[PDB]
Amino acid sequence: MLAKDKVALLIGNMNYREHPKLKAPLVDVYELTNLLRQLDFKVVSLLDLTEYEMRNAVDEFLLLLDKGVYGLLYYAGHGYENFGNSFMVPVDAPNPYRSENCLCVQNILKLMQEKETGLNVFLLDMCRKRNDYDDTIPILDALKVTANIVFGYATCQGAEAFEIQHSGLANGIFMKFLKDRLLEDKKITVLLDEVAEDMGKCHLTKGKQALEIRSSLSEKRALTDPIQGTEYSAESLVRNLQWAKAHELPESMCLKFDCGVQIQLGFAAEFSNVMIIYTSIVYKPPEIIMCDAYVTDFPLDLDIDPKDANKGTPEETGSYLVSKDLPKHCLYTRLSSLQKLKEHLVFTVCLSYQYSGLEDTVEDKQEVNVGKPLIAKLD
Protein backbone atom coordinates (compact mmCIF):
# COMPACT_ATOMS: atom_id res chain seq x y z
CA MET A 1 0.00 0.00 0.00
CA LEU A 2 1.22 3.48 -0.92
CA ALA A 3 0.08 7.02 -0.08
CA LYS A 4 0.39 9.97 -2.47
CA ASP A 5 1.20 12.07 0.58
CA LYS A 6 1.08 11.79 4.35
CA VAL A 7 0.00 14.91 6.28
CA ALA A 8 -0.62 15.58 10.00
CA LEU A 9 -1.97 18.51 12.02
CA LEU A 10 -1.21 18.39 15.74
CA ILE A 11 -2.64 20.84 18.25
CA GLY A 12 -1.96 21.12 21.95
CA ASN A 13 -4.00 23.52 24.04
CA MET A 14 -2.96 23.93 27.67
CA ASN A 15 -3.10 27.53 28.87
CA TYR A 16 -6.80 28.29 28.92
CA ARG A 17 -7.71 31.80 30.04
CA GLU A 18 -11.13 30.88 31.46
CA HIS A 19 -10.78 27.13 32.18
CA PRO A 20 -8.31 24.91 34.06
CA LYS A 21 -4.80 24.87 32.58
CA LEU A 22 -3.08 21.72 31.30
CA LYS A 23 0.61 20.73 31.26
CA ALA A 24 1.19 17.56 29.21
CA PRO A 25 -0.13 18.50 25.74
CA LEU A 26 3.31 20.09 25.07
CA VAL A 27 5.17 16.79 25.59
CA ASP A 28 2.42 14.74 23.87
CA VAL A 29 2.43 16.95 20.78
CA TYR A 30 6.23 17.25 20.69
CA GLU A 31 6.85 13.53 20.97
CA LEU A 32 4.07 12.59 18.50
CA THR A 33 5.41 15.18 16.07
CA ASN A 34 8.79 13.51 16.21
CA LEU A 35 7.37 9.95 15.74
CA LEU A 36 5.23 11.08 12.82
CA ARG A 37 8.26 12.75 11.25
CA GLN A 38 10.16 9.49 11.57
CA LEU A 39 7.30 8.03 9.46
CA ASP A 40 7.81 10.81 6.86
CA PHE A 41 4.59 12.69 7.61
CA LYS A 42 4.55 16.36 6.66
CA VAL A 43 3.63 17.66 10.15
CA VAL A 44 2.44 21.01 11.55
CA SER A 45 2.53 21.32 15.35
CA LEU A 46 0.96 24.22 17.20
CA LEU A 47 0.51 25.15 20.89
CA ASP A 48 -2.22 27.17 22.57
CA LEU A 49 -4.46 28.27 19.71
CA THR A 50 -7.57 30.44 19.78
CA GLU A 51 -10.76 29.55 17.87
CA TYR A 52 -9.66 31.73 14.97
CA GLU A 53 -6.17 30.23 14.94
CA MET A 54 -7.50 26.67 15.21
CA ARG A 55 -9.76 27.24 12.24
CA ASN A 56 -6.92 28.72 10.23
CA ALA A 57 -4.67 25.85 11.07
CA VAL A 58 -7.31 23.46 9.87
CA ASP A 59 -7.68 25.44 6.64
CA GLU A 60 -3.93 25.09 6.01
CA PHE A 61 -4.03 21.33 6.79
CA LEU A 62 -6.89 20.96 4.30
CA LEU A 63 -4.77 22.65 1.64
CA LEU A 64 -2.24 19.83 1.84
CA LEU A 65 -4.89 17.14 1.38
CA ASP A 66 -5.44 15.64 -2.06
CA LYS A 67 -6.90 12.49 -3.54
CA GLY A 68 -5.12 9.53 -1.97
CA VAL A 69 -3.39 11.59 0.76
CA TYR A 70 -3.36 10.26 4.34
CA GLY A 71 -4.60 13.00 6.68
CA LEU A 72 -4.15 12.80 10.46
CA LEU A 73 -5.39 15.14 13.18
CA TYR A 74 -4.09 14.85 16.74
CA TYR A 75 -5.52 17.01 19.49
CA ALA A 76 -4.49 17.26 23.14
CA GLY A 77 -6.50 19.73 25.17
CA HIS A 78 -9.97 20.32 26.53
CA GLY A 79 -12.85 18.89 24.56
CA TYR A 80 -16.47 17.91 24.91
CA GLU A 81 -19.08 15.70 23.27
CA ASN A 82 -22.75 16.42 22.59
CA PHE A 83 -24.90 13.83 20.75
CA GLY A 84 -21.85 11.95 19.48
CA ASN A 85 -20.31 15.12 18.04
CA SER A 86 -16.77 15.89 19.21
CA PHE A 87 -15.78 19.49 19.92
CA MET A 88 -12.29 20.94 20.50
CA VAL A 89 -12.05 23.79 23.05
CA PRO A 90 -9.60 26.64 22.18
CA VAL A 91 -7.63 28.56 24.85
CA ASP A 92 -9.77 31.68 24.34
CA ALA A 93 -13.10 30.01 25.14
CA PRO A 94 -15.28 31.85 27.70
CA ASN A 95 -16.81 30.20 30.76
CA PRO A 96 -19.33 29.01 30.00
CA TYR A 97 -19.01 28.40 26.28
CA ARG A 98 -21.12 27.17 23.37
CA SER A 99 -20.43 25.14 20.21
CA GLU A 100 -19.76 28.33 18.17
CA ASN A 101 -16.66 28.93 20.29
CA CYS A 102 -15.34 25.43 19.51
CA LEU A 103 -14.39 23.29 16.55
CA CYS A 104 -16.50 20.34 15.58
CA VAL A 105 -14.38 17.36 14.50
CA GLN A 106 -17.02 15.89 12.19
CA ASN A 107 -17.11 19.02 10.04
CA ILE A 108 -13.40 18.73 9.63
CA LEU A 109 -14.02 15.13 8.48
CA LYS A 110 -16.58 16.36 5.93
CA LEU A 111 -14.12 18.86 4.49
CA MET A 112 -11.39 16.19 4.37
CA GLN A 113 -13.70 13.82 2.48
CA GLU A 114 -14.34 16.57 0.02
CA LYS A 115 -10.62 16.41 -0.73
CA GLU A 116 -10.86 12.64 -1.45
CA THR A 117 -8.26 11.61 1.11
CA GLY A 118 -7.20 7.97 1.04
CA LEU A 119 -7.18 7.87 4.85
CA ASN A 120 -8.73 10.00 7.57
CA VAL A 121 -7.29 9.55 11.06
CA PHE A 122 -8.51 11.37 14.18
CA LEU A 123 -6.73 10.97 17.45
CA LEU A 124 -8.68 12.91 20.02
CA ASP A 125 -6.88 13.03 23.32
CA MET A 126 -9.57 14.91 25.20
CA CYS A 127 -12.56 14.51 27.49
CA ARG A 128 -15.84 13.41 25.97
CA LYS A 129 -18.36 14.61 28.54
CA ARG A 130 -21.31 16.80 27.73
CA ASN A 131 -21.28 20.57 27.76
CA ASP A 132 -24.71 21.35 29.16
CA TYR A 133 -24.45 25.08 28.48
CA ASP A 134 -24.39 24.27 24.76
CA ASP A 135 -28.09 23.73 24.08
CA THR A 136 -27.97 23.53 20.30
CA ILE A 137 -29.15 20.41 18.52
CA PRO A 138 -27.07 20.42 15.35
CA ILE A 139 -28.31 18.79 12.17
CA LEU A 140 -24.91 17.62 11.02
CA ASP A 141 -25.10 16.43 7.44
CA ALA A 142 -24.63 12.70 6.89
CA LEU A 143 -21.10 11.71 5.92
CA LYS A 144 -20.32 9.92 2.68
CA VAL A 145 -19.34 6.26 3.04
CA THR A 146 -15.60 6.71 2.44
CA ALA A 147 -14.45 3.49 4.15
CA ASN A 148 -11.35 5.50 5.06
CA ILE A 149 -12.22 6.68 8.58
CA VAL A 150 -10.47 5.84 11.85
CA PHE A 151 -11.11 7.54 15.14
CA GLY A 152 -8.90 6.91 18.07
CA TYR A 153 -10.44 8.48 21.10
CA ALA A 154 -8.33 8.61 24.26
CA THR A 155 -11.49 7.97 26.29
CA CYS A 156 -15.05 6.63 25.91
CA GLN A 157 -18.09 8.79 25.25
CA GLY A 158 -19.42 10.40 28.44
CA ALA A 159 -16.07 9.81 30.15
CA GLU A 160 -12.80 11.74 30.77
CA ALA A 161 -9.24 11.67 29.36
CA PHE A 162 -6.33 12.26 31.76
CA GLU A 163 -2.74 13.36 32.23
CA ILE A 164 -0.51 12.76 35.21
CA GLN A 165 0.18 15.43 37.74
CA HIS A 166 3.85 14.86 38.03
CA SER A 167 6.35 17.67 38.35
CA GLY A 168 8.67 17.65 35.36
CA LEU A 169 7.88 15.89 32.10
CA ALA A 170 5.08 13.33 31.86
CA ASN A 171 2.84 12.26 29.01
CA GLY A 172 -0.93 12.06 29.14
CA ILE A 173 -2.34 8.53 29.49
CA PHE A 174 -3.10 8.11 25.79
CA MET A 175 0.36 9.19 24.56
CA LYS A 176 2.04 7.25 27.36
CA PHE A 177 0.76 4.15 25.64
CA LEU A 178 0.56 5.28 21.99
CA LYS A 179 4.20 6.26 21.63
CA ASP A 180 5.50 2.70 22.15
CA ARG A 181 3.33 1.37 19.33
CA LEU A 182 3.08 4.17 16.83
CA LEU A 183 5.94 3.07 14.59
CA GLU A 184 4.61 -0.45 14.09
CA ASP A 185 4.04 -1.64 10.53
CA LYS A 186 0.42 -2.61 11.14
CA LYS A 187 -2.97 -1.46 9.95
CA ILE A 188 -3.69 1.64 12.08
CA THR A 189 -6.85 -0.04 13.47
CA VAL A 190 -4.92 -3.04 14.82
CA LEU A 191 -2.25 -0.71 16.25
CA LEU A 192 -4.84 1.32 18.08
CA ASP A 193 -6.38 -1.96 19.33
CA GLU A 194 -3.01 -2.93 20.86
CA VAL A 195 -2.96 0.55 22.38
CA ALA A 196 -6.37 -0.07 23.95
CA GLU A 197 -5.01 -3.27 25.48
CA ASP A 198 -1.94 -1.47 26.89
CA MET A 199 -4.13 1.23 28.53
CA GLY A 200 -6.35 -1.44 30.07
CA LYS A 201 -3.35 -2.40 32.21
CA CYS A 202 -3.30 1.04 33.84
CA HIS A 203 -4.47 0.81 37.45
CA LEU A 204 -4.71 4.57 37.79
CA THR A 205 -7.20 4.83 34.92
CA LYS A 206 -9.22 1.65 35.52
CA GLY A 207 -12.91 2.42 35.37
CA LYS A 208 -12.25 6.05 34.50
CA GLN A 209 -10.61 6.09 31.08
CA ALA A 210 -10.37 3.55 28.22
CA LEU A 211 -9.44 4.00 24.55
CA GLU A 212 -12.38 3.85 22.13
CA ILE A 213 -11.72 3.03 18.48
CA ARG A 214 -14.28 3.76 15.80
CA SER A 215 -13.41 2.52 12.33
CA SER A 216 -14.90 2.12 8.90
CA LEU A 217 -11.53 1.47 7.20
CA SER A 218 -11.82 -1.40 4.68
CA GLU A 219 -8.24 -1.47 3.45
CA LYS A 220 -4.88 -2.39 4.94
CA ARG A 221 -3.69 1.16 5.37
CA ALA A 222 -0.87 1.74 7.80
CA LEU A 223 0.87 4.88 9.01
CA THR A 224 4.12 3.29 7.84
CA ASP A 225 2.95 3.10 4.23
CA PRO A 226 5.51 4.53 1.83
CA ILE A 227 4.86 7.78 0.01
CA GLN A 228 4.57 7.24 -3.70
CA GLY A 229 5.95 10.64 -4.57
CA THR A 230 5.55 10.34 -8.31
CA GLU A 231 2.36 12.20 -9.23
CA TYR A 232 2.69 15.55 -7.50
CA SER A 233 1.00 18.35 -9.39
CA ALA A 234 3.23 21.37 -9.74
CA GLU A 235 0.92 23.31 -7.45
CA SER A 236 1.34 20.55 -4.88
CA LEU A 237 5.15 20.71 -5.02
CA VAL A 238 5.04 24.45 -4.37
CA ARG A 239 2.68 23.76 -1.47
CA ASN A 240 5.13 21.10 -0.31
CA LEU A 241 7.99 23.58 -0.68
CA GLN A 242 6.03 26.17 1.31
CA TRP A 243 5.37 23.55 3.96
CA ALA A 244 9.08 22.81 4.06
CA LYS A 245 9.78 26.52 4.51
CA ALA A 246 7.32 26.66 7.41
CA HIS A 247 9.07 23.58 8.75
CA GLU A 248 12.45 25.26 8.60
CA LEU A 249 13.70 28.11 10.81
CA PRO A 250 16.03 30.81 9.43
CA GLU A 251 19.68 29.77 9.58
CA SER A 252 21.77 31.48 12.17
CA MET A 253 23.31 34.86 11.32
CA CYS A 254 26.60 36.31 12.62
CA LEU A 255 26.16 39.97 13.56
CA LYS A 256 29.05 42.39 13.04
CA PHE A 257 28.88 45.47 15.24
CA ASP A 258 30.56 48.74 14.27
CA CYS A 259 32.87 48.44 17.31
CA GLY A 260 34.14 45.16 15.84
CA VAL A 261 32.53 42.54 18.11
CA GLN A 262 30.57 39.61 16.65
CA ILE A 263 27.54 37.89 18.10
CA GLN A 264 26.01 34.57 17.02
CA LEU A 265 22.24 34.55 16.54
CA GLY A 266 20.88 31.03 16.61
CA PHE A 267 17.43 29.52 16.13
CA ALA A 268 15.67 26.37 17.27
CA ALA A 269 12.15 25.06 16.72
CA GLU A 270 10.15 23.61 19.58
CA PHE A 271 6.84 23.65 17.68
CA SER A 272 5.76 25.18 14.39
CA ASN A 273 4.64 28.22 16.38
CA VAL A 274 7.38 28.16 19.06
CA MET A 275 10.96 29.16 18.38
CA ILE A 276 13.95 29.45 20.61
CA ILE A 277 16.47 32.25 19.99
CA TYR A 278 19.94 32.07 21.43
CA THR A 279 22.76 34.59 21.45
CA SER A 280 26.43 34.21 22.36
CA ILE A 281 29.52 36.45 22.67
CA VAL A 282 31.62 34.71 20.02
CA TYR A 283 34.19 37.46 19.31
CA LYS A 284 35.99 40.45 20.85
CA PRO A 285 38.63 42.87 19.63
CA PRO A 286 40.89 43.05 22.70
CA GLU A 287 40.59 46.82 23.07
CA ILE A 288 37.14 46.09 24.50
CA ILE A 289 37.34 44.52 28.00
CA MET A 290 33.70 43.55 28.69
CA CYS A 291 30.82 42.43 26.46
CA ASP A 292 27.05 42.11 26.99
CA ALA A 293 24.63 41.01 24.32
CA TYR A 294 20.88 40.67 24.72
CA VAL A 295 17.65 40.70 22.67
CA THR A 296 14.57 42.97 22.83
CA ASP A 297 11.82 45.04 21.13
CA PHE A 298 9.80 42.06 19.91
CA PRO A 299 6.46 42.58 18.18
CA LEU A 300 3.65 43.11 20.71
CA ASP A 301 1.69 40.27 19.11
CA LEU A 302 4.12 37.80 20.64
CA ASP A 303 3.41 39.17 24.14
CA ILE A 304 6.96 38.26 25.23
CA ASP A 305 7.90 38.93 28.89
CA PRO A 306 11.34 40.62 29.20
CA LYS A 307 11.53 39.04 32.66
CA ASP A 308 11.39 35.68 30.82
CA ALA A 309 13.94 36.50 28.10
CA ASN A 310 17.76 36.35 27.86
CA LYS A 311 18.22 33.43 30.26
CA GLY A 312 21.08 31.24 31.48
CA THR A 313 19.37 27.98 30.52
CA PRO A 314 16.67 27.08 27.98
CA GLU A 315 14.88 25.58 31.00
CA GLU A 316 14.53 29.09 32.43
CA THR A 317 12.47 30.28 29.45
CA GLY A 318 9.80 27.63 29.76
CA SER A 319 11.55 25.63 27.13
CA TYR A 320 11.91 22.27 28.78
CA LEU A 321 11.60 20.20 25.62
CA VAL A 322 14.76 21.33 23.82
CA SER A 323 18.02 21.41 25.73
CA LYS A 324 21.46 20.00 25.29
CA ASP A 325 20.08 20.10 21.86
CA LEU A 326 21.19 23.68 22.12
CA PRO A 327 24.71 25.08 22.31
CA LYS A 328 25.74 25.70 25.91
CA HIS A 329 26.83 29.05 27.22
CA CYS A 330 24.22 31.15 25.41
CA LEU A 331 21.41 33.51 26.38
CA TYR A 332 18.02 31.97 25.55
CA THR A 333 14.66 33.50 24.60
CA ARG A 334 11.39 31.67 23.91
CA LEU A 335 9.19 33.05 21.19
CA SER A 336 5.82 31.42 21.41
CA SER A 337 2.59 32.34 19.64
CA LEU A 338 4.40 32.80 16.32
CA GLN A 339 1.00 32.40 14.60
CA LYS A 340 0.00 35.79 16.04
CA LEU A 341 2.55 37.55 13.84
CA LYS A 342 1.06 40.33 11.70
CA GLU A 343 4.45 41.57 10.48
CA HIS A 344 7.79 40.05 9.68
CA LEU A 345 9.47 39.24 12.86
CA VAL A 346 11.70 42.17 13.64
CA PHE A 347 13.63 42.62 16.85
CA THR A 348 16.71 44.30 18.29
CA VAL A 349 20.08 42.88 19.24
CA CYS A 350 21.59 45.16 21.85
CA LEU A 351 25.26 45.26 22.84
CA SER A 352 26.96 46.89 25.84
CA TYR A 353 30.74 47.20 25.99
CA GLN A 354 33.62 48.99 27.68
CA TYR A 355 36.97 49.74 26.01
CA SER A 356 40.19 48.96 27.83
CA GLY A 357 41.34 52.14 29.52
CA LEU A 358 38.11 54.01 28.81
CA GLU A 359 35.72 53.67 31.72
CA ASP A 360 32.29 54.49 30.40
CA THR A 361 29.92 51.87 28.92
CA VAL A 362 28.82 52.12 25.26
CA GLU A 363 25.36 51.15 23.98
CA ASP A 364 24.98 49.94 20.36
CA LYS A 365 21.98 48.05 18.88
CA GLN A 366 20.72 46.75 15.53
CA GLU A 367 17.39 45.59 14.13
CA VAL A 368 17.40 42.00 12.88
CA ASN A 369 14.65 40.87 10.53
CA VAL A 370 14.26 37.17 9.90
CA GLY A 371 10.81 38.22 8.69
CA LYS A 372 8.22 35.46 8.89
CA PRO A 373 9.11 32.72 11.35
CA LEU A 374 8.05 29.14 10.70
CA ILE A 375 4.28 28.65 10.55
CA ALA A 376 3.91 32.38 9.95
CA LYS A 377 5.05 31.97 6.34
CA LEU A 378 1.97 29.85 5.58
CA ASP A 379 -0.35 32.82 5.90
Added chain:
Amino acid sequence: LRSR
Protein backbone atom coordinates in the same frame (compact mmCIF):
# COMPACT_ATOMS: atom_id res chain seq x y z
CA LEU B 1 -4.37 12.70 37.61
CA ARG B 2 -5.47 15.64 35.47
CA SER B 3 -8.76 15.96 33.57
CA ARG B 4 -8.88 17.13 29.94
